[PDB]
Design a protein around this ligand. Structure first.
Ligand SMILES: *[C@@H]1O[C@H](CO)[C@@H](O[C@@H]2O[C@H](CO)[C@@H](O[C@@H]3O[C@H](CO)[C@@H](O)[C@H](O)[C@@H]3O)[C@H](O)[C@H]2NC(C)=O)[C@H](O)[C@H]1NC(C)=O
Lengths: 438, 52, 52, 49
């Protein structure tokens, strides 16, 4: 027997689905969403790590001259300075007094720990959602792992389920991502090959294991002081370190809807938004024949108390008349109220009690026990406490019933004024028609 | 506020309807020195209570 | 690493007043998990009170 | 109240009775040690000072 329904994407919400097949006793299903996971698709763009600049020992060809030659190193710098008269620990060599030359070189390379301490830049799109849900009915428990798109069906004890695509298409990960350790940032990194000194991406590599490197740190060399051998340079500090110092914020503490970011792989877990459609298919062994189910006639509903709190705060009593004692499947045919349980024991005494939760001052809903029916209407009072640590178990509707006290007063006042207006119109039209008849 | 404005608009309109009806029903009698017809004089509150 | 003491909470009308007693500079952050959050994070040093 | 003035009070200096409210909460000891951990809000008198 094919069936379909819709359930909210809120962790811990005790969704109950009610299936009524005309030839068999009604059945009630309990479903919950134990865990979710919104995993995006990643295209690694490049990697960054702190740089390390290497300075080869200066070559002083003295009483002679040298020539500078180019090489292929990232950000290579080399120069020749004339007129050097160096000194050493014993005494100044290069005895040819003033015709000397020093050749300085410098070039940059990735740090030693670039494979242990680095930041990645990604482009993210097309999220895929995964879920883990609990199903109960009849006498079968069990939680199962499901892909949420209309392309995975999992069988639970003879029943087949399919979870349709998410109603909304909201994803917290922006178009461009920067990942470090276990933190995700909505940053806009500069493209490959166009970094700037002193900021993020001053050196860039395609991957951690690659050979090439593109570095741009404005490395400059200065003529050495007289009587020294020290090859001075100047260079703006590592961009990665200052990005570390002033990255600013994160996503783990800024994502909406209260969903936790993690890493390895990047994902957003338990992230409350939207609705999940469910398409079912059931075998004939799941139901029960009418003949063995109890018969319930003359169903009446009363409400003991109501209290629109987060926990189940209303007690409801049902009176009936039955022939034999057994089991029935309670349900509420509206979302204004949510019952706690999905089964009840019916006995010859004739009275049963249930717990429900609401969020409106005056609810009015129809409750069914096995195949019977009844209407329940009640008045509710506010809760006195201010803060609680467990989430809402009602579906959060506040518009009252049309028979509620507030709408009763509105209706009475509107009726009085409308009747007065109709009387006015009748008087004026009567006078006009009397004027015409003459 | 919306409900209050609707109520006031309705009540003022209906009162205006009664006023216009009384003017229409009483202005012909204000052009002839005739009887006020005690039967309608008591029913509808006109300017002359008992003065003709 | 050590764990700082639990703060003292006071319940209010949609507001929570919170007493903080640190021994060394700790990090304190919070967010409202609605549709549009209230981002915030701070480095508390000496004993203070916050309202959230 | 714990954490402010008057968390510990005595009727007089020599009084045997004492009223204390400091939210002293014990914890489960870590594996392989004998140290009876606890946690407790600092003294309110010093913060009043
Ligand atoms: C369907 O299966 C799930 C998991 O197998 C059942 O949930 C489990 O219910 C038992 C009994 O209620 C829990 O054991 C108790 O947990 C409390 C938690 O405070 C603990 O204090 C007790 O000492 C005892 O261990 C168990 O934790 C719970 N499991 C989970 C993951 O929540 C569920 O009850 C089954 N359905 C039915 C109708 O029994």
């Amino acid at each position: 027997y094919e069936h379909s329904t819709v359930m909210p994407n809120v962790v811990g919400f005790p969704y109950k689905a009610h299936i009524e097949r005309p030839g068999y006793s009604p059945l009630t299903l309990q479903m919950q969403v134990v865990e979710t996971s919104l995993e995006p698709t990643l295209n690694l763009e490049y990697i960054t790590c702190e740089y390390k600049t290497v300075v080869p020992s200066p070559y002083v060809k003295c009483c002679g001259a040298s020539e500078c030659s180019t090489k292929e190193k990232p950000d290579y710098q080399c120069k020749v300075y004339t007129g050097v008269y160096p000194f050493m620990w014993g005494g100044a060599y290069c005895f040819c007094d003033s015709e000397n030359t020093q050749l300085s070189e410098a070039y940059v390379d990735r740090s030693d720990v670039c494979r242990h301490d680095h930041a990645s830049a990604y482009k993210a799109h097309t999220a895929s959602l995964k879920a883990k849900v609990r199903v109960m009915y009849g006498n079968v428990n069990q939680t199962v792992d499901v892909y949420v798109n209309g392309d995975h069906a999992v069988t639970i004890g003879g029943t087949q389920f399919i979870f349709g695509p998410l109603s909304s298409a909201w994803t917290p990960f922006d178009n461009k991502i920067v990942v470090y350790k276990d933190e995700v940032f909505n940053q806009d990194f500069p493209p490959y090959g166009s970094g700037q000194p002193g900021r993020f991406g001053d050196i860039q590599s395609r991957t951690v294991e690659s050979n090439d490197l593109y570095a741009n740190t404005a490395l400059k060399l200065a003529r050495p002081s007289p009587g020294m051998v020290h090859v001075p340079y100047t260079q703006t500090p590592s961009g990665f370190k200052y990005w570390l110092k002033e990255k600013g914020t994160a996503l783990n503490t800024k994502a909406p809807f209260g969903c936790q970011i993690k890493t390895n792989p990047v994902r957003a877990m338990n992230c409350a938004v939207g609705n999940i459609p469910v398409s079912m298919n059931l075998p004939d062994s799941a139901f029960t024949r009418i003949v063995e189910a109890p018969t319930i006639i003359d169903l009446t509903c009363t409400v003991a108390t109501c209290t629109h709190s987060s926990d189940f705060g209303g007690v409801l009593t049902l009176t009936y008349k039955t022939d034999k004692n057994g089991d029935c499947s309670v349900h509420s045919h509206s979302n204004v109220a949510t019952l706690q349980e999905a089964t009840a024991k019916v006995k010859t005494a004739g009275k049963v009690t249930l717990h429900f939760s609401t969020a409106s001052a005056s609810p009015s809903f129809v409750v069914s026990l096995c195949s019977a029916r009844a209407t329940c209407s009640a008045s509710c009072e506010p809760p006195k406490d201010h803060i609680v640590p467990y989430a809402a178990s009602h579906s959060n509707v506040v518009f009252p019933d049309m028979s509620g006290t507030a709408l009763s007063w509105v209706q009475k006042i509107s009726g009085g004024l409308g009747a007065f207006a109709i009387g006015a119109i009748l008087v004026l039209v009567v006078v006009t028609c009397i004027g015409l008849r003459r | 506020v919306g409900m209050s404005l609707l109520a006031l608009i309705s009540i003022f309109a209906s009162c205006y309807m009664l006023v216009a009806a009384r003017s229409k029903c009483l202005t012909p009698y204000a052009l002839t020195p005739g009887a006020a017809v005690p039967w309608t004089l008591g029913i509808l509150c006109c300017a002359p209570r008992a003065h003709a | 690493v050590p764990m700082a003491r639990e703060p003292t909470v006071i319940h209010g009308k949609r507001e929570v007043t919170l007493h903080l007693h640190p021994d060394h500079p700790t990090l304190f952050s919070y967010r409202t998990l609605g549709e549009d959050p209230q981002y915030h994070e701070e480095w508390v040093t000496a004993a203070v009170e916050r309202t959230i």
